[PDB]
Write a new protein. Structure first.
Lengths: 87, 51
């Protein structure tokens, strides 16, 4: 699953909620949770374009209303070879 | 008939409705309170702060 998405928010109530939705939506692999610092939390997800899209949209709209909610969320269709250094 | 007496001066005792206080809002459902709406402690942002 080269296609990459990631959900970032303030605090990880929405982060784990969105990651739960991620895994909940398709056969996607959660490759890493990162504490940004200052309250931002990021969750990475890998898969194919359609599955990643469905997962990310489901999780984003689910987590926009929990606690303080998402901050931003977009998708990378053809991630560069530098993804391995990026993880 | 039998001479009764009145006395008292205040009739019935001042029984208070134990139901009172109120002031604040009941603690986020799930513990008491009828009627209402909101959510079954859903994962929704509401969840705890369901209000």
């Amino acid at each position: 699953g080269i296609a990459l998405g990631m959900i970032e928010t303030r605090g990880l109530v929405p982060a784990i909620e969105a990651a739960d939705a991620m895994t909940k939506a398709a056969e996607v692999r959660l490759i890493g949770r990162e504490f940004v610092g200052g309250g931002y939390v990021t969750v990475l997800v890998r898969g194919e374009t359609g599955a990643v899209n469905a997962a990310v949209r489901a999780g984003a709209d689910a987590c926009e209303r929990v606690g303080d909610g998402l901050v931003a969320a977009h998708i990378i269709a053809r991630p560069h070879r530098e993804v391995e250094p990026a993880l | 008939r039998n001479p009764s007496r009145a006395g008292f001066m205040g009739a019935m005792p001042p029984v208070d409705n134990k139901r009172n206080d109120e002031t604040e809002k009941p603690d986020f459902l799930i513990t008491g309170s009828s009627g209402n709406t909101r959510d079954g402690q859903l994962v929704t942002f509401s969840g705890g702060a369901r209000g």
